[PDB]
Amino acid sequence: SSNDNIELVDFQNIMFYGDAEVGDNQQPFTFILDTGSANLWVPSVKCTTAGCLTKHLYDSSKSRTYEKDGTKVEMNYVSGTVSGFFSKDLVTVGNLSLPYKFIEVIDTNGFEPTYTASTFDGILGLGWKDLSIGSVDPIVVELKNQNKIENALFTFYLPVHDKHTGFLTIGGIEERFYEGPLTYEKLNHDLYWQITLDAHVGNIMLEKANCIVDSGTSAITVPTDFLNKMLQNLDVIKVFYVTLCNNSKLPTFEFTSENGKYTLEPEYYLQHIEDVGPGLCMLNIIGLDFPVPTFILGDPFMRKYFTVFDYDNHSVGIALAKKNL
Numbered sequence: 447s448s449n450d451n452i453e454l455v456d457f458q459n460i461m462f463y464g465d466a467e468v469g470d471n472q473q474p475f476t477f478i479l480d481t482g483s484a485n486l487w488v489p490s491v492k493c494t495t496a497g498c499l500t501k502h503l504y505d506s507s508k509s510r511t512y513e514k515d516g517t518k519v520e521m522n523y524v525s526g527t528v529s530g531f532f533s534k535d536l537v538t539v540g541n542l543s544l545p546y547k548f549i550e551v552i553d554t555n556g557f558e559p560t561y562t563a564s565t566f567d568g569i570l571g572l573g574w575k576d577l578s579i580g581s582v583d584p585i586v587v588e589l590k591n592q593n594k595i596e597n598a599l600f601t602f603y604l605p606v607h608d609k610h611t612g613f614l615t616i617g618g619i620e621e622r623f624y625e626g627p628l629t630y631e632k633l634n635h636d637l638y639w640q641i642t643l644d645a646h647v648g649n650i651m652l653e654k655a656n657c658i659v660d661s662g663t664s665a666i667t668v669p670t671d672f673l674n675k676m677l678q679n680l681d682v683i684k685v686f687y688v689t690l691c692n693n694s695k696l697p698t699f700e701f702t703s704e705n706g707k708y709t710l711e712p713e714y715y716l717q718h719i720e721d722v723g724p725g726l727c728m729l730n731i732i733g734l735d736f737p738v739p740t741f742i743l744g745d746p747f748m749r750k751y752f753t754v755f756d757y758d759n760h761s762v763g764i765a766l767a768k769k770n771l
């Protein structure tokens with residue numbers, strides 16, 4: 447390989463994780479790798495909440511490269527919050543490292559119960575600068591500016607449960623991860639990796655929809671009216687929504703563009719829950735409303751489609767992911 451590759455591990459076809467290190471002594475952490483975010487945080491030894499107790503806890507006194515900051519910070523996500531302070535230290539992703547500004551989280555109460563139930567320690571954001579808190583240049587943009595990579599781009603080939611591992615790749619595109627053509631879609635905003643596409647489910651449409659490609663999200667989210675229209679006379683029961691996995695009325699998402707066509711079928715957006723019951727699926731689709739009608743294409747989408755996030759060309763590339771390497 448001529449690129450930096452970091453292996454991704456699956457967690458029951460819902461979420462995936464990847465490891466990176468912080469500190470010149472390479473203390474290991476498990477991260478959500480999140481193109482929907484623009485900050486890096488790890489839980490600190492100074493964390494006082496209960497969630498932190500089983501986590502890998504970052505200790506700045508072990509790194510000669512640590513550089514104090516201390517500015518207080520709260521990190522807000524759609525479905526939780528963590529707080530702490532800024533610090534700077536060597537951050538290492540695959541085999542590339544750089545001095546980088548990140549957050550030492552000391553309070554995780556705003557992430558519970560998910561945090562304690564899950565195996566990740568922190569989050570490693572991979573969005574654009576203006577999405578970040580504390581005005582911090584993206585890791586991959588810095589690598590480029592520091593001449594540690596030649597191309598400011600990264601790709602996601604997601605893992606599938608009991609089939610194969612995945613790869614986050616920084617610095618170039620590897621044909622081995624995908625099949626059929628690679629189509630590029632220009633960002634509508636240098637913020638999230640968000641592009642404009644026409645959405646169609648049944649006889650429902652949203653032209654010029656804002657679509658966030660978000661690796662740190664374990665569902666597809668749609669605007670709530672759009673969801674309600676999708677649910678009409680569909681044989682699903684509002685408990686989050688449960689359906690028979692073979693429910694023949696379950697529609698296919700279509701997203702079209704100037705020069706690309708992408709689909710998402712029920713087999714990708716159904717979160718099998720066959721331990722609640724035999725032939726039983728969760729709709730892995732959530733209603734969520736932003737100022738402008740938005741779709742978040744999360745893990746279900748990125749599990750089907752290989753993706754490229756190119757900062758130099760301000761665009762996202764999309765292709766069918768190879769079913770097996």
Ligand SMILES: CC(C)C[C@H](NC(=O)[C@H](C)NC(=O)C[C@H](O)[C@H](COCc1ccc(Br)cc1)NC(=O)[C@@H](NC(=O)c1ccccn1)C(C)C)C(N)=O
Nearest residue numbers: 480482483522523524525526557560561660662663664665
């Ligand atoms: C709330 C906004 C007004 C604030 C906004 N902030 C952001 O836009 C931040 C930077 N990014 C995001 O919130 C999107 C991220 O991709 C985020 C990543 O978080 C994952 C996450 C969240 C909560 C727990 Br617990 C564990 C893991 N995904 C999510 O929060 C998704 N949740 C989930 O995927 C999820 C998965 C598992 C458990 C709980 N939630 C969500 C989109 C549906 C802003 N303007 O600064």
